[PDB]
Write a protein that binds this ligand. Structure first.
Ligand SMILES: Nc1ncnc2c1ncn2[C@@H]1O[C@H](COP(=O)(O)OC2CCCC2)[C@@H](O)[C@H]1O
Ligand SMILES: Nc1ncnc2c1ncn2[C@@H]1O[C@H](COP(=O)(O)OC2CCCC2)[C@@H](O)[C@H]1O
Ligand SMILES: Nc1ncnc2c1ncn2[C@@H]1O[C@H](COP(=O)(O)OC2CCCC2)[C@@H](O)[C@H]1O
Ligand SMILES: [Cl-]
Ligand code: NA
Ligand code: NA
Lengths: 667, 642, 525
């Protein structure tokens, strides 16, 4: 039909064909001829993964040992594997092979917080630095099967460190540089990292950040860390190094030669751990394989973004998140193109920084978070007209609900109505894109991620019956019907948590945690999390971890944290706190600031609640457990719709929550 | 037609394979007849490169190709096969079959009590092996380590062995009936870094103290860093030592159901198997042993993909290693792993298992057959055993009468019987009738198997005996793929035991006879000669000769390695020493005199009164007895006369 | 015709290789004449990929193929060859020849006293190396470890080096004449986990205190967990420390005569050779190719030939031309433990005659010693099996060159004055036997892959044209070039690559005459 009774988003939405200028700027014949070819290849990727992914793995990856079996295992048994028997090395495929072919080709276009510190590393340069750092790590005893923590800003050293660790067959664990000391401690200890790579201080938005200081604080409780390599980012002499543990990047790398042989690893040996927050309270180390993850990165970077050897990719993200892993580092470097590594913020020295960088380097592909787009539309629209952005042809949206208005704003003010937009849906555990419009191929519906990608057999499941929904104009739980090459393989030393989270809720399926709708054309519309996970400014947060942080403050007796819509950050965190012996509304403002600072120092500045609400007690059930549902409805001004609260043990509390929120949220 | 030497063979009619064997056989046999067998056998002896090369590539999956089929000689103790090759044993026994047919049964596990029986598919097995291998890998187990297994004959023993091989470490299976002292000797000789066991066992309805005996042994096993403990009974009173012992279920739950196998070289050790003198760790290679296991299981038993093998043995012995685990799993067929006894809950259990699973092949020790004949004969007829076509006898003297009983009461005179001759150090069958191919003579093992150039040797001269109707020492003229490669960290004992007694041959320690049809009849153990500069001496004859001297109270004679004369004889019992040496020369012969006669007042014996010759051997080469104090005196006494 | 700069070249007649060289040669030479050499040489400079690639596949056996022949630059100190390839040095030196002909002699061992001499076939050598490697493996030695060797020039030293390489570990040979302090400095710089030595040594009849010097050094070498001690004299008064020192014979007896070799990457280190003492590091594939290539073409070695390098494995000379070079090519090599003077000054010649050696390689210092004290001894022995006479690595004056040529060579042999250094791995400039005519005192033409040049020291600019003098420098790296100084790559850059960026600095001055022949003039320091 033409009308939708379920997928209201899709009603009256005209398809948006790729503008003709995209093809004028495309340097070669596209990788896919048209949408009909896409659908034929997609069906083969589902019906015959062996015949589809086999040849692509042999085209796009360089193997030290051939694989004998494309695909093994099932979701239900949590034993997925790809390219069994194969051996390869990630740093060889991202660096060496390109350096041998064209050593002077740019690899890392590094834009520092202050442009005067910007520089460019060629693939040849990259090979020498990666070899030297791997040389240091090898002399420290790092070997295949070890884990190594990285705590670095988004710059050349973070990329070099990751590739040097992979060069030895060890697994890197990158810890976002905005994390607090406690967050560093939790991740380092779960992985039992033998070494850490960090720097003395950072520069962000003109400010100096305390990086090494936080490591020292965390490391007093990290007994497995034997050595730390410290890069002189500011060269501040007041930054202390602990004798016998900490060593300088420049001093140690000067001891080793600019070539070190890469270590062959099996396709299914771990490439990295990436700690993620869930509905648990403790971070879980998501583990990615080597071959399957790398194939997914190359495949999605090539086909969804339409990347060619002549192109230049600017992923405005951070390696602390999966976005930087896959689309700032592995994807582009696998394909041998330059990637722009941006250390600063979109606002410094002014709101034109993104566009100055695109123009400076003639970037052809730009990949950004809707959170930044909303900020730039609000505060920096007047900066765009100052820059020539005609080198661009593909505009990606990293992964957040994008409204049709922002889609149109992005399309008009950045793309001049001449670029293709790729709203990519995916998650840390998918490794690479799951649903996205292929640049130059798939027509767009603004706000829809469009079609599932190669190897992704998406489905909607009825939340009442657990049964897969046939046909279109449907909505339900978003699930995937078979595993795919870049799917996460386990949670580090906690495979049971992995099973309970992803494979057991809907047996036979992978559970994304999202709800979605599928319209009459088969386009998917993401409707957001069904599992109460909260994403603030593109960053996935654990409400339970924030509650635990607030409870550490001994003035607090109970804490409940929920998420709500926010026009800036997508979602915001609202914290409800009951104090032990408080009162004094003159101390309210002050005690609220103290609790926010508590979360800032325990988790990190980016997990701080938007607002802390002081209440006399929280709503609970007969069993005594907190009813967050009530807090959610109140915090979104849906006080009506609470319904029958006679089932609570303390219904009288609800009145207090409605009034406290209406009094305190503003102020 | 008549035999003047091989009396066993006189008047023995050849027993052709019953027609029903071929009716039950699911496909054309692997060999048409005895003429084809002999053509293939001659190639396996004259042209091993051209014979075993193609079979190795057919039957095994390689990570790296081999460049040389065969290297080394018996005389130099440097046998090697498929040099340059790389492979993994668990990949060949599990992964490749799981990818092809994950739902095919792999381990048919019959527990002591049938209520606890279960079946693991090849897909199931891969996941369990991967998870346990993950635990061991997180503990630091890697290529070149040894890991001890002390488990009953059940799925966990099989999983443990394969998980250890998956990492390229070598497993050392310790029979679960062994005492604490027996565990300690084996763990320490191998320096195992980890141990896999269970809390308690179930045998014949009784509860056995498995973990308790391990704890007792481990107080003197400093190399064991961690222990993985399966909850076989889940008895809450079984203590786990904090920081050392961990639960199988708790740890394997942390790891995924796939873990990459580790490639090893063809000649990297697959396992140590300790023999029950001092226990010695028989070391087997990877590629050659696996090829021997698959080849003998395929051709001697006539195993096809449709078949089902029930080896009523134990992984604590080579029988379980080769024909309960590696042989059948290599060929991708199901194998029946039986934890109990032939008598529990009743004397029909063996036959109830065969009927339940429609086993096509049954392999058992004559010792078990004699028990069932004595106490449970009438139970056999109560079960449908018509799925069987091959009945194997594991390896012990089977009389013609037991052969006929086995053939009639179990096989209903419709099955082929395979009396297999082999030993721990041979890895796989040496002499056996190929099922459906070789006609039987009851009590004869028949023809040597592929790659086995068997011979009869005169025990005095070591010279090969030509022609048939002959008897002598059973010896092998060249090494073979699954031949044991060394004794762990004691290669000189290996040489002295197998290669040096009869230079140019492998010494089986057995005597045998060869009849006019070329069939071998195993005649049992020879009496342990010591080779001194080409003269073979009997320690027992020297002891007896010394004892004839009425001034002598006790005498014990032992052999030890010697760099010039090969071995030397030391006798434990200035003028009397000369008289005793002269006594041996005039009684036995001029070249039989001991290198030295040492005067001692006493030396160790056991409760049975048998002399602990091991003690003297170690003393002459520089508490467990019934008279421990005795040992002390000789530390000086050996230093006194020698 | 005249030289205004290269005064050494004036009035020097070319010395064609004598006629008898080709009569004694067992097969058609590997290169026909100087013109064919210059065609091959130019390809090795212009197109190293197409020249060395095929040669690497011809002369070495690979466990994994390489994907790239050559990588890196001198200026960046990141040279690499045969990238991606895997191989094992002991497989190429032992296993593959043992399989083909196990009874062919490998180590012709002449002891300090001839009564103790013996010969190991390739089959023999595989068993002894397997057993020693089995000992080291049981001790935990693995790829990436270093093992120190403090042994005289005898079978045990060759077996130890090969057994360490068999496991993919790196051997660090310490000349048996070094003091305890010299042992300590090397052992600690390399952090060796094990040491292989002997109880005592025999040199010129005298007994040397070998284990005793080790024991003194080991008090300050905490990384050494175990020591393997060969009973060279079997002196019972030599102390072994309980729990650290073990006997070679006692431990090897426990292990079998075959052990699988361990694959290493082309650019994994094969050995550290210390020259304070700096550890020169040599790759595996590049070094081995250089060793086989120079031994084959400069010395004209054929499968039937027999090489006598009168050197010591404590120096690079024994590494490349007593062990790796000849064993790679599958020919016998003579390992001489003694001195040219004991029991008499006819020892070298009695050995050449005894084994019908075809090639002899020695330093001029020994030549000067024999000319002074043992010239009459030469005539007593039959040296008619020789055809190539080598000069290891010192300035050979025309007088010595003429004496060497007449009295040892009977004016029927070719002489190869080889110029090279520890850091070059193998010969840099040398006359190819049966190909390059000689000028006494001149090393002649650069070898394959060696693009030699002269640099004006004052200006640092490369000197065009001939009749020139200046600093000797190489313009691109070569397969056997040392890759670093152990854990001190900055000292490596400062010494070799930074003085003249874009060049490899030899530290020597040289002259190039109108024919292109090079005359080594000595250190610039
Ligand atoms: N195109 C999209 N449109 C709407 N919502 C989206 C879209 N992509 C992702 N999400 C939500 O983000 C979660 C994943 O979070 P995370 O693992 O941090 O990955 C982030 C960071 C990099 C990729 C996203 C999904 O499960 C969804 O809820
Ligand atoms: N078919 C046979 N007929 C008569 N005797 C036989 C036969 N097979 C073996 N033996 C004797 O058992 C020793 C080997 O014992 P073992 O290594 O424990 O192996 C056990 C477990 C597997 C085989 C037996 C032989 O050397 C012989 O003396
Ligand atoms: N044919 C030669 N003519 C004149 N001088 C020569 C010649 N060969 C080398 N040198 C000098 O020896 C140094 C190298 O010494 P070393 O590294 O010990 O290697 C030497 C000793 C062991 C092997 C060679 C060169 O740099 C030069 O100074
Ligand atoms: Cl006597
Ligand atoms: Na390989
Ligand atoms: Na390999």
């Amino acid at each position: 039909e033409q009308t939708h009774n379920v997928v209201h988003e899709a009603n009256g939405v005209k398809l948006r064909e790729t503008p003709k200028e995209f093809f004028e700027r495309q340097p070669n014949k596209g990788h896919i001829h048209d949408v009909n070819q896409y659908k034929q290849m997609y069906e083969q990727s589902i019906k015959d993964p062996q015949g589809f992914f086999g040849p692509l793995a042999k085209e796009l990856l360089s193997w030290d040992h051939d694989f004998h079996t494309v695909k093994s295992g099932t979701l239900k048994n949590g034993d997925a594997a790809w390219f069994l028997g194969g051996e390869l090395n990630a740093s060889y495929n991202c660096v060496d092979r390109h350096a041998f072919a064209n050593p002077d080709k740019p690899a890392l276009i590094c834009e520092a917080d202050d442009e005067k510190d910007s520089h460019i590393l060629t693939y040849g340069d990259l090979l020498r630095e990666v070899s030297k750092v791997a040389g240091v790590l090898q002399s420290w005893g790092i070997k295949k099967g070890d884990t190594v923590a990285v705590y670095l800003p988004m710059n050349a050293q973070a990329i070099i460190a990751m590739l040097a660790i992979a060069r030895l067959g060890a697994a890197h664990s990158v810890i976002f540089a905005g994390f607090s000391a406690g967050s560093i401690k939790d991740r380092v200890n779960d992985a039992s990292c033998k070494a850490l790579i960090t720097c003395d201080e950072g520069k962000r938005g003109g400010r100096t950040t305390n990086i090494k200081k936080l490591c020292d604080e965390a490391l007093v409780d990290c007994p497995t860390v034997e050595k730390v390599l410290v890069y002189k980012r500011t060269n501040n002499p007041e930054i202390h190094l602990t004798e016998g543990r900490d060593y300088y990047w420049d001093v140690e790398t000067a001891k080793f030669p600019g070539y070190l042989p890469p270590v062959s690893v099996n396709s299914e040996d771990p490439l990295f751990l990436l700690y993620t927050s869930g509905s648990t309270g403790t971070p879980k180390g998501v583990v990615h394989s080597t071959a399957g993850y790398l194939l997914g990165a190359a495949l999605s970077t090539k086909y969804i973004f339409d990347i060619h050897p002549e192109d230049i990719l600017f992923t405005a993200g951070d390696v602390g998140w999966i976005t930087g892993h896959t689309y700032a580092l592995y994807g582009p470097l696998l394909l041998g193109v330059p990637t722009i590594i941006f250390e600063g913020t979109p606002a410094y020295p002014d709101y034109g920084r993104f566009w100055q960088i695109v123009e400076k380097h003639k970037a052809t592909h730009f990949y950004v978070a809707p959170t930044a787009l909303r900020l730039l539309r609000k505060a920096g629209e007047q900066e765009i007209a100052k820059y020539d952005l005609s080198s661009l042809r593909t505009l990606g949206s990293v992964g957040e609900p994008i409204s049709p208005d922002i889609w149109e704003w992005y399309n008009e003010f950045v793309g001049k109505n001449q670029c293709h937009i790729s709203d990519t849906y995916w998650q840390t555990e998918s490794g690479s894109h799951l649903i996205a419009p292929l640049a130059g191929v798939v027509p767009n519906k603004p706000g829809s991620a469009s079609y599932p990608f190669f190897g992704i057999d998406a489905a909607l499941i009825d939340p009442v019956t657990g049964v897969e929904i046939e046909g279109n104009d449907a909505e339900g739980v978003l699930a995937i019907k078979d595993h795919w090459p870049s799917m996460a393989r386990t949670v580090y030393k906690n495979h049971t948590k992995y099973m309970d989270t992803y494979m057991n809720p809907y047996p036979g399926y992978y559970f994304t945690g999202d709800g979605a709708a599928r319209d009459h054309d088969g386009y998917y519309w993401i409707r957001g999390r069904v599992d109460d996970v909260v994403n603030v400014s593109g960053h996935r947060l654990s409400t339970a971890e924030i509650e635990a942080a607030l409870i550490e403050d001994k003035k607090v007796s109970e804490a409940a944290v929920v998420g709500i819509h926010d026009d800036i950050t997508g979602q915001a965190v609202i914290a409800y706190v009951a104090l032990k012996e408080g009162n004094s509304d003159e101390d309210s403002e002050g005690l609220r600031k103290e609790l926010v600072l508590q979360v800032r120092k325990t988790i990190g500045p980016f997990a701080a609640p938007k607002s802390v609400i002081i209440v006399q007690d929280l709503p609970k059930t007969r069993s005594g457990k907190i009813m967050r549902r009530i807090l959610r409805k109140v915090s979104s001004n849906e006080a009506d719709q609470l319904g029958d609260i006679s089932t609570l043990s303390n219904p009288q509390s609800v009145e207090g929550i409605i009034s406290a929120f209406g009094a305190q949220f503003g102020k």
